[PDB]
Symmetry: C3
Subunit: 454 residues, 3 copies
């Protein structure tokens, strides 16, 4: 058999697991060991997007689940616990395990119970693990996946940083960015029609103030999973290249590629060398996932510009949209205040400010000035002030034809923005009305609901 390094030696090792996007330290060991892994399933509500809650089923309290790191040749004694608060039974299938179900039939664990099984890690590589409890797709869709690294005996080459990034497709009853506690939607799941496609379990999980970091000159290794359940990632780094891409424990290593296909249930190790500063975007380049469903993550590089290599600027909201900013916490706060019945004008303003970035600013500018004769102003806009209901219709349904704004004719096309939810339209317009010497007041979600229905 592969991994024939003899019986376990030394002392038993209690594995230290990490939460995304961090990775345990290299094992730094020259002998096979008995490694005890303890992982606890927790079912819990978390925010999948601002003001959007979802009941996740997790390994270790996170999506993806805790990262496990062992050495090829190790004997792993795997303990799965199911927290007493759980409603469902759970189990585990670790890719890389040699044995039926990857552990599944010996890890069935009812709420409040524990199971264990032992396996030898014969297979070096990066591997997905996931729940294997019928209906398996529901469990995976609810977040039950993570990565296990089985190191080669000599260890991986040293790098400056190691990170943990895992894609998933998610299925809510409601549409993208519809607020509230969103149930799992089996119909969308069977159809492979996700409402969100995310890295690390949430919109913005790895953007803004949650970005990954490194410095010019440093090397970064990313362990990249695709939990699925259903999608295949056209995994890509914007503005950079991967030095190496290696799938699972494969012998083949691809070098110097920017775009690489990760199967559902697959995993890869990628390596990046930081060359010039700025934000490097990890995406699924099936582009509507990246830019319409949440599938964007950032590696932000600090250091000196090199004008011989790249003369240009850091990213902003034209490309990154509303994820250029550190966070969109104002949206969470406004949503909470709506639930509580305490939504103020300022709550709406600050939420709308966050959402305006990209969504409106690309054309109207971050200061609402537009560009005279090309994009009309929202700042001190006579046309806006004249008819706030018309403005709700414009956002929902677009606008074309000749108009006059602040004394100048425009004859262009504003696309419809019907995918915005009622609260989003309301908040954005309340922001605009309360900025730039506009007349104030507010637009409510109910106001927008009525226009959308007419």
């Amino acid at each position: 058999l592969p991994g024939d390094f003899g019986p376990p030696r030394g002392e038993p090792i209690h594995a230290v697991l990490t939460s995304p996007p961090l990775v345990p330290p290299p094992v730094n060991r020259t002998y096979p060991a008995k490694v005890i892994v303890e992982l606890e399933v927790v079912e819990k509500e978390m925010q999948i997007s601002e003001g959007v809650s979802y009941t996740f089923w997790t390994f270790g309290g996170t999506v993806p689940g805790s990262f496990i790191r062992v050495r090829q040749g190790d004997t792993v004694e795997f303990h799965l616990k199911n927290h007493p608060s759980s409603k469902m039974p759970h189990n585990i299938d670790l890719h890389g395990v040699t044995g039926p179900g990857g552990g599944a039939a010996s890890s069935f664990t009812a709420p409040g119970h524990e199971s264990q099984f032992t396996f030898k890690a014969l297979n070096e590589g990066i591997y997905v693990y996931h729940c294997a409890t019928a209906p398996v797709g529901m469990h995976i869709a609810n977040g039950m996946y993570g990565l296990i690294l089985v190191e080669p005996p000599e260890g991986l080459p040293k790098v400056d940083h190691e990170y943990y990034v895992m894609q998933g497709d998610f299925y809510t009853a409601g549409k993208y960015r519809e607020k509230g506690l969103q149930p799992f939607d089996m119909e969308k799941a069977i159809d492979e029609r996700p409402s969100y496609v995310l890295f690390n379990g949430a919109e913005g999980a790895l953007t803004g103030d949650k970005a990954l970091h490194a410095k010019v000159g440093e090397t970064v290794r990313i362990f990249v999973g695709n939990g699925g359940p259903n999608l295949v990632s056209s995994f890509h780094v914007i503005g950079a290249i991967f030095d190496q891409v290696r799938y699972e424990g494969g012998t083949n290593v691809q070098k110097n590629v920017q775009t690489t296909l990760i199967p559902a249930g697959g995993a890869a190790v990628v390596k990046f060398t930081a060359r010039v500063p700025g934000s490097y975007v990890l995406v699924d380049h099936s582009i509507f996932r990246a830019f319409n469903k949440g599938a964007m993550a950032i590696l932000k590089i600090d250091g000196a510009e090199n004008k011989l290599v790249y003369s240009g600027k850091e990213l902003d909201s034209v490309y990154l949209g509303d994820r250029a900013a550190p966070n969109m916490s104002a949206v969470t706060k406004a949503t909470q205040a709506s639930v509580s019945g305490t939504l103020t004008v300022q709550d709406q303003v600050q939420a709308g400010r966050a959402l305006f970035a990209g969504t409106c600013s690309v054309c109207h500018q971050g200061n609402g000035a537009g560009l005279p004769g090309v994009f009309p102003p929202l700042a001190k806009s006579d046309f806006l002030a004249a008819d706030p209901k018309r403005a709700m219709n414009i956002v929902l349904h677009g606008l074309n034809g000749k108009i006059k704004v602040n004394g100048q004719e425009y004859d262009s096309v504003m696309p419809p923005m019907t995918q915005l939810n009622d609260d989003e339209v309301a908040n954005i317009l309340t922001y605009v009305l309360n900025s730039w010497d506009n007349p104030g007041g507010r637009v409510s979600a109910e106001d927008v609901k009525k226009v959308r229905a007419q």
Copy 2:
């Protein structure tokens, strides 16, 4: 040109073709030959799932079609016959053929006719063949695909077993597991929204008593096709690894991977070494295909356990669901009896027993005992007996909130199971009512139809 081994020598060889999942013997030949291939198209109803018929269009009476095995450098005289019973014309495009359409324009064959053409096999590799008759997608969707192996001159390395597995996506007017003769659905096909995703033309074609077999220590080569028409397979082996994966006749060979992407119309040769006993599941790891649409196949390994490698158990219905059992023939029988107007209580009981496995047993247990205070019992259930109509609503629409069953409170969540068809709900509940000291009687498909409509 490649394959430049000179003119055909020896005697003409009449190729012996095999039906899935078997493969012809290695050619075991050191000279190029003239090989005569005879393949007959047959249109016929077969069961795509238990009690679900479909009009397949086949090469050689099977889906996938008969396997063809030749040597690089051979001259192949290909004869296509179209059975007199056919309604459609058919033809063939063999990947690996050097010439327009892979043979298509010289193989147009009306019902009751024969065509022939000759090609040299310049290209070693495993290759899909398929029908090439407008509308091509309809013909492929109806089952018209198979594999041709063109061996390298020296032959492939010897292995203990060779098998033939081919994925396809299928488009029925009815939903998954809706009984009856199901028409092809062009709308679903254009949308790439299959109702079934299968290996070898049927649910359960390679599970249970139809599993592939080998023994601990043996090597298994699988010729894996993806007929499509539309899907790309995240092809994966649960609980094992592929020693090698080689696509078509490519020079590159990947080694030691578990998950590998097979294009629509693609084919690969994979190699597996049996290490420990049990069931190894071939899936499309776009998971709802594998676990909700039929895309699972089994390689069952017999031999001694090795507790140093894997301490755990063989798979059961928690992972494999209703495909853990040898077969689900009771469902076929009950469906037939419904058609005939002779459906008995026992017919329903036995069908429901088959369907209960996984679908209900994961939580309620195979003996209906549940787990006290966590999953309520179906065995001798006062709550079930009290209101059989309520039980139909529970299966369709789920249940949550505090309930009392057999003297104990439960406060959990049973997900809706609305994807079950009326007959399935009826049969499952009739099974439950006639087991475990429950009160007997029956639930009909019409009963369930009425609840579903209310």
Copy 3:
């Protein structure tokens, strides 16, 4: 850094860009240069299919955009202009650029404006470029993508021909082949449900009289892009093999494969050696794209047959359908005449002739003779003449059961053809009625609309 060939030398070079499917000449240079690239965005209506207009957003007036060819180590001074007629702002992200957004944040260009930025081409390879302006998916869906080649310092090996082919998925409000100016459909785009899947921006862009050409014995290199936005191509050549496939600037080169997966946003260089004459079809082998949505392109090889390699015939309409013929200009003309209110019987006849090929001829024959007792005749058909409205119903809804046509019984199945648009049914039936001694007259689109509604 890679590409460390020193400062730019010689004279600044103004890059000569080419329109698809042509490629600039090899750079044929041994020193790094400063290369000035000028690319202008143009928004314009073009025909996506005959009689189907679409507002494309283009780099250089074409879909895909102009091809850019530079050498690894070059300093590229990139100038993006946005034509004054544009309504939207645009920018660019070039894969292969080392820097945030691949250029995006330094190329924001309002209508009537110009931007520039400079980058060093560190990375050899073939790379997609595309617009990076929110909503990015809308911009890409409207055609804003192309290829840039960064040659290795020594140049690529010489070949006889180089071509430029780029796949895209498109989202119209109307169905496939519905005539008129078709808006972009955001809902279909988010759902990844394209109405068209095309090479080079239009149905038939690379078929018939627009095919790519080479001769027996010649080598052809194709730079193959996948602009997406969303689909992954099962990219395949019918009746041939790729000598080599190399993705982006990857070190790995696959040899001797026929089917290869191109990620959304990916690109590859493929090499083909012409062996025998005829038409070789480039497809996305997710087959309904190729045969139902437009994803077919042709490389036509001229030269001597070699019966030792392939005895058979060139492709015709059985496989290629209505794209076997040089063009379908009659459809464009009939559509225009409908708009103008001048549609004649002959306009309809000639359009219907074009559409009949494949769609009807596969069974009824190009001369309408059918095959006695198997496919009934359309030529001098008593059954057709007897009831033209019945014939509209047959096309839309199919026909089965015993019928008598010209004295002979048929008992077969004609599938429904409901995906045909009203004008298409009308034109096809008007063609049939005005051919083969049929009674003449005409069927209108309004006639068909009424039957479809009943």
